[PDB]
Design a binder for this molecule. Structure first.
Ligand SMILES: *Cc1c(COP(=O)(O)O)cnc(C)c1O
Ligand SMILES: *Cc1c(COP(=O)(O)O)cnc(C)c1O
Ligand SMILES: [Cl-]
Ligand SMILES: [Cl-]
Ligand SMILES: [Mg+2]
Ligand SMILES: [Mg+2]
Ligand SMILES: [Mg+2]
Ligand SMILES: [Mg+2]
Ligand SMILES: [Mg+2]
Lengths: 389, 379
């Protein structure tokens, strides 16, 4: 039992970690994983989780174990990490830059079934010319703009859809599908508006696929998604897969959109109280914006949580206390309502540990080299995640 | 050689000639004021950047985390001030650094934190050097500049408890809400006077107070005189940023840190160029939104570093930035001006926030080559 005794001596808990730390409540993370996978199984579509929220091998392993099919990545560094870890079905869902083609070629030549996306004739021409030069039939999907959010060919822009699809297909590449991301779902906050946007996202992606196929071009995959529209879609006829990422943890922006409650948020930042300004009702904590990130997505929503909702050590919300301000390594904990708490030092004594729910899980997670994955027994384990490009 | 044409994007680029000018300007101002400069490395967390600050005449550093103290001590820097109210649970970490030879200084602003340090120091045989943080402007931590009984209670806990009461410090961070030389000069004087007043109160009580330490970059550059001050702490000046430009202490052309980005697409009807520098590259900091000129997620510059006024990142998602006209109009033929693959450089709202998004900087020399300069992430 030499290993056992030594490992027990080294095991951390929420009391022994240094702060700040990004804590994943594994039981909440597994409920979120199951909820999404079950919804997609009920819809008869594949779930291709977007790992840009955690960039962590063990978190994606849990998603794969639950039934996910492949992943979506936001950078080729994520494709390199997850392919090294055994994931071969990877979609790089950012408009392809020609200068990154040698790295995408190398990944495919090592055995990664890496898919790229474009939304322009010039990007299609760059991929097809390099593929012909290098003897590589890249798989390329066409990105569709279904809601005005960001990149993509308009769903009704048949001439440009065909021009890009022909450039790829005639060029000897594999035109593998269409995808869309209805990111404007983050501006909504009612179930009726989310359900309608989910239907516009489905209808527009399938419209683009049907236009390509009406021109004789292959388009076997139809991929949609954002977490809110994944959870709100009534029907997904014509869709092969849904992509969703932030759901794995949720956050307060998702709580305000209405697709989860604060009790579903699996990621919190463990912080210590390091001081006060008693006459202003401030407790000062060691989670500033370097821990929380500068994300303030809740500022324009129905309930502004400042730099995060305060919870006790046990992870239960402490209503009315939020981080009202943040500097790099100092957070200002005070009443959301703008009163000065009396006796703030008795409410929050020096050295008290608290947990802060984030505005945006993807933004807060990226501030940490690793998560501390919290098991039901109170034990944590360090789960590394990727930083940079 | 690696150059701005060969790097992958996004990348954090330091223009070394601009950084050296910013380093010289600050050190020459501190020398003119008769005070030491103790740079705050939380902006770069990079050994070669702090080396350049030391070569120019800096005396010790300030750090925002013990991880920084570990990094810089492993690189040979021993005169380290950890300028965040000390948490008692980090005392074992601080003790081990001191026992290894790091001359690590801690700060406190409460009797309870001072008692925890003094009790642990006596148990472990360690006379911790502790400074008392003074609140001169209501920004953040510190003993109020008027609150003499609290100041003396802490000073006596430390000195009677066997610890080394090494000084007082203040950080007038409310300087970042100002934007005129008269208001910055007045706040710099309030910061100076408040910190010197606390030192005098300690000394009048028979307590040691050899160091009087003030600073933020705007008050460091605006102070007219620094009588009674021994050192100034400043950090973001090494690179500057657009929040600094709006406060009025630099020009956009002085900003030494930019994010190299590639154009990866367009929305021509809206006049957008989409770049691969989203908020993961720039950070979510939007400090210019509250100032007199809003630069969105950053100011566009060409690959040579020429500022392109009127183009900014008007929006950002994680790995996509939206480049568009600041005047709200849809640039006609945006794709013809910025073809796919064009490289641009984006000046940040907040240098300390943008830098923390990158594992390393790319230090750009006069000949156009780059050298990778690692920086620290995490705690
Ligand atoms: C982020 C992202 C997703 C996942 O959206 P969430 O709302 O985080 O689930 C899907 N597709 C693309 C292209 C994305 O960038
Ligand atoms: C950040 C910081 C500084 C340096 O301020 P800048 O405006 O970045 O130069 C000085 N002192 C303390 C305590 C700080 O936190
Ligand atoms: Cl700060
Ligand atoms: Cl995003
Ligand atoms: Mg997100
Ligand atoms: Mg690389
Ligand atoms: Mg006060
Ligand atoms: Mg700063
Ligand atoms: Mg540490």
């Amino acid at each position: 039992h030499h290993h056992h005794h030594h490992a027990m001596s080294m095991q951390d808990t929420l009391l022994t970690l240094d702060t700040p730390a990004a804590v994943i409540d594994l039981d909440r993370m597994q409920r979120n994983i199951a909820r999404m996978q079950q919804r997609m199984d009920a819809q008869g579509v594949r779930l291709r989780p977007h790992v840009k929220t955690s960039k962590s091998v063990p978190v994606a392993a849990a998603q794969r174990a639950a039934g996910a099919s492949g992943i979506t990545v936001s950078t080729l560094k994520e494709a390199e990490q997850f392919f090294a870890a055994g994931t071969t079905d990877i979609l790089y869902a950012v408009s392809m830059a020609p200068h990154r083609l040698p790295q995408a070629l190398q990944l495919r030549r090592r055995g990664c079934d890496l898919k790229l996306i474009v939304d322009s004739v010039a990007a299609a021409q760059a991929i097809a010319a390099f593929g012909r030069e290098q003897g590589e039939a890249f798989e390329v999907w066409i990105e569709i703009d279904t809601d005005g959010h960001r990149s993509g060919v308009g769903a009704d822009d048949t001439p440009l859809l065909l021009a890009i699809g022909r450039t790829l297909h005639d060029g000897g590449m594999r035109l593998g599908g269409v995808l869309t991301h209805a990111g404007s779902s983050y501006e909504l906050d009612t179930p009726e508006a989310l359900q309608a946007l989910a239907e516009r996202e489905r209808a527009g992606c399938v419209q683009a696929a049907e236009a390509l196929r009406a021109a004789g071009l292959p388009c076997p995959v139809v991929s949609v998604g954002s977490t809110p529209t994944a959870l709100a879609a009534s029907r997904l006829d014509g869709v092969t897969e849904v992509r969703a990422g932030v759901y794995v943890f949720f956050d307060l922006v998702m709580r305000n959109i209405g697709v989860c409650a604060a009790e579903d948020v699996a990621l919190s930042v463990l912080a210590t109280v390091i001081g006060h300004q008693a006459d202003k009702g401030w407790a000062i904590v060691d989670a500033g914006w370097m821990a929380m990130s500068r994300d303030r997505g809740t500022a324009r929503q129905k309930q502004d949580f400042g730099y995060g909702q305060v919870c006790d050590l046990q992870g239960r919300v402490m209503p009315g206390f939020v981080l009202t301000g943040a500097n790099q390594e100092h957070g200002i904990l005070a009443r959301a309502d703008g009163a000065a708490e009396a006796d703030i030092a008795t409410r929050f004594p020096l050295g008290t540990r608290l947990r802060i729910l984030p505005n945006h899980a993807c933004a807060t997670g990226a501030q940490f080299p690793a998560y501390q994955a919290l098991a039901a027994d109170g034990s944590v384990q360090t789960w590394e995640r990727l930083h940079g490009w």
